[PDB]
Amino acid sequence: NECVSKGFGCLPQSDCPQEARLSYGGCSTVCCDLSKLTG
């Protein structure tokens, strides 16, 4: 889990925009960052 290593979460296919999606396979359908909450 690439996203879990990097400390990120996992969002649904509707709430994660195409700008916030990560380049990794750290989830089971899509992975999204959490950096918008910190800034």
DSSP 1-30: -HHHHTT-----TTTS-TTTB-SS--SSS-
Are residues 15 and 29 in contact, defined by beta-carbon separation less than 8 angstroms? no
Counting every residue, how long is the chain? Answer: 39
* CATH code linked to domain 1-39: 3.30.1680.50
- Amino acid making up residue 26: G
Domain boundaries, the chain: 1-39
- Amino acid making up residue 35: S
